[PDB]
Amino acid sequence: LSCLTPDNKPGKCVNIKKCTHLAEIEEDPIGEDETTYLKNSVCAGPEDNSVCCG
């Protein structure tokens, strides 16, 4: 699916088990700043088992 980045840039929407960005967060430590950025890069909805990658 096509998603728009926080800056409204053309991107794609994928589950929470494929996007490289998700793998980086799972491999690296977690923080409040990472949770806020991840929530903003979601496929519309704090909970939808999906994320937006652009």
Domain residue spans of the chain: 1-54
**CA geometry: angle at 47 spanning 34 and 18, to 5°?**
65
Determination technique for this entry: NMR
CATH architecture of the domain with residue range 1-54? 2-Layer Sandwich (3.30)
d(C-alpha 40, C-alpha 7), whole Å: 11
- H or E segment and range at residue 24: helix 20-27
Contact at 8 Å (CB) between 48 and 42?
Answer: yes
DSSP character for 15? Answer: E
- CB-based contacts of 34-40 (< 8 A; 24+ apart in sequence): 40/6
Alpha-carbon span 30 to 34, nearest angstrom: 6
Helices (H), strands (E): how many in the chain? 2, 3
Please tell me the total number of residues recorded for the chain in this structure.
54
Per DSSP, 6 falls in state T
